[model samples]
Target: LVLGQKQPTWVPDSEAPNCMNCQVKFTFTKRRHHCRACGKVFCGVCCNRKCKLQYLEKEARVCVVCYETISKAQ
Candidate 1:
């Protein structure tokens, strides 16, 4: 994400790790999800677990950092 590089291949989970903050890259699995708000894709690692930070709202999917930043101004 340093320069917004589009991953050539979607995560192949068998090879990648389960966490983005981990040393290894994340693999693609069935749970691989995309942020509806930004169009950037993240593997299952960034989804579901961070409910307070990020979550699926109806048809919308949002990142926690984006949510918090937006909320602070309001």
Candidate 2:
């Protein structure tokens, strides 16, 4: 199946206490952000990268891993 044809299942905010990539703890200052590509929670820094997901008309924020993967694939 192609990625982004349908919205990904987002990881619940309550399920993620820290950034999935960096494993950094989330607090008041560090808020949770979801990667549009994978729907996993990440800190702003880790999810800062943006990419054009196939299903999205505009660029969307994605995690570094998804960014790199999509970049290489494209």
Candidate 3:
């Protein structure tokens, strides 16, 4: 999101549905996930987490790795 910059390695919905972190195949059940901070794609196993982002001004879905990095930085 954020100016619709969902490109440049950012996961594109349906265009490329794979967990960028774990490389897990995206399925209807497994589903695809995105990190608000980094805009990387991941699966629930690797990105099943969330955090409040000032950019979004609300709680948003973020990959587990991003969550840790953002938490420490914040």
Candidate 4:
């Protein structure tokens, strides 16, 4: 995910709770989050990047595909 770019569904106050794997604190502010595979709305904290999502210490919005890609890349 692009850093500083917000997923649409994210509100300024509440975050999505879909991705239980995520460990970071972020809120959606711009674009609505849609699953690249299913095209479903995955809102709240799920819209943000996981804390474990590290590639040289930079947090990434680890979508399912992204998670796999990083894992494979490593």
Candidate 5:
């Protein structure tokens, strides 16, 4: 998939009760971070990696999948 060809549809909070990667439940301390690349909700630990997104024109947080995908592509 194209990493930043277009804006991704963000998974709503209601739809994602847990971290998409670690499957950990979201609590007050465990906040959900939306990946700018894939728009999927993830915990900070899983989504802390930053990379430049073509659409955003700047570096932004992304999940491991997106980070790996884009890094490999480059």
Candidate 6:
């Protein structure tokens, strides 16, 4: 078994309003990538980082802060 970042329940991409992670403007090019770990929409740099979440039971995405935080826990 693994002990790491658990399942994340995040907000919807459409209703994200803004990039919750980096506070960037989501435009045609500045797309939104939801962090499966937190379920929040973020810009490429802030929420583009990806990893495997155990609770998700599959390969999912994790934000930069979430990834960094979980890394310290392990």
> lDDT winner among the candidates?
5
The digit string of per-residue lDDT tens for model 5 on 1-74 reads: 37776789999988999999989999989999999888999999999989888888888889989999987776
**Higher-TM-score candidate of 5 and 6:** 5
User: Model 4, range 1-74, lDDT digits (tens) per residue?
Assistant: 43223332332233443443344433455334544322233444454444243323545444555445545655
lDDT of 2 by residue, 1-74 (tens): 25555668899999999999999999999999999988999999999988888888778998988889887777
**TM values, all candidates:** 0.35, 0.88, 0.74, 0.28, 0.92, 0.75
Q: Which parts of model 5 are misplaced by more than 4 Å?
A: none
Tell how far residue 63 is off in model 4, in angstroms: 0.6
**lDDT tens per residue, model 1, 51-72:** 2222232334434443344345
Candidate 3: list runs displaced more than 4 Å.
1-10
lDDT of 2 at 27: 100
Top-scoring candidate (TM-score): 5
lDDT of 6 at 11: 76
Ranking by TM-score: 5, 2, 6, 3, 1, 4
Clashing pairs in 6: 10-39
Clash pairs, model 5 backbone? none
- Per residue, candidate 3 scores C-alpha lDDT tens digits across 1-74 of 33222322455776756788887888879887777777777888888777777766677777877788766766
Displacement of residue 66 (Cα, Å) in model 4 is 1.2
The per-model lDDT (C-alpha) reads 0.37, 0.88, 0.70, 0.40, 0.89, 0.70
Prediction-by-prediction clash tally: 4, 0, 0, 10, 0, 1
